[PDB]
């Protein structure tokens with residue numbers, strides 16, 4: 001079966017063209033709808049189609065955001081079109097996205113089940129690209145709100161990483177309140193658990209730190225029973241937050257009645273084989289005080305990733321590393337001076 005739709009390019013001008021695809025099969029699910037895999041008749045290239053029920057009255061936040069983005073470390077919106085569904089009054093938005101099958105989650109699971117550790121070189125590669133993609137979106141004031149291993153797609157051969165699933169993403173506006181119960185639980189920042197509604201894109205940074213730790217440990221670092229137990233799991237490592245730290249998180253409620261627990265030193269949290277740079281970076285990601293956390297750009301500048309800036313660095317499969325230094329002014333906006341560190345001599 002060959003299907004044809006009138007679809008508008010994602011980043012291109014607003015002019016619909018005919019698009020044909022075949023080999024359609026379901027590969028994903030969610031409250032939003034369904035996700036298909038298909039092959040374009042033109043390029044024979046594989047693509048994901050995210051199908052979301054559309055409230056014809058309101059605009060789709062994910063579409064808006066997706067159309068603005070153009071980055072190597074973000075899954076790009078090829079096309080979008082509309083279709084019919086069930087009732088005669090229902091309209092579905094379809095997002096035609098890059099198809100990348102492997103995920104940081106599956107990759108990390110293979111290692112975890114083999115009682116093995118993911119080689120630090122990959123940790124650096126993956127985390128660096130994640131921080132770069134976050135630096136990009138944050139420069140637009142856009143927060144992802146769902147950073148987790150499942151949302152990090154991997155090309156196993158090039159070690160290119162791409163951020164996906166902007167269904168929870170939003171452009172944060174100082175003054176306007178945001179929902180607190182957001183993000184996947186293990187990767188949920190502490191302020192969110194405190195019911196904060198005036199939070200910043202630094203919640204993504206917390207999430208990223210959770211991913212790093214998980215990759216270093218072989219399992220989630222804060223595996224909470226629930227949204228509230230999530231805080232207990234956190235406390236059992238960072239120790240009870242101080243009254244000032246709690247104040248910083250902008251709480252809607254603090255009546256938790258948590259028992260007094262002392263911090264567990266980072267060096268003790270990880271395997272002894274763990275590089276200090278990784279521990280050091282982690283400790284400045286997972287901080288109670290939101291403003292105390294590194295920005296993605298600073299994180300990219302961290303020493304943990306120095307090896308990546310070495311002119312001789314190579315992928316374990318012998319190939320060259322993906323392009324990591326081709327920054328744009330947009331990307332460096334939050335702190336241009338960092339270019340000195342981010343863009344190395346040999347790269348210029």
Ligand SMILES: C[C@H]1Nc2cccnc2NC1=O
Pocket residue numbers: 027028035048050075097098099100101102153164165
């Ligand atoms: C939406 C997200 N889904 C997906 C699943 C498997 C492979 N690639 C994908 N691309 C995506 O954007």
Ligand SMILES: [Cl-]
Pocket residue numbers: 156157159315316317318
């Ligand atoms: Cl490789």
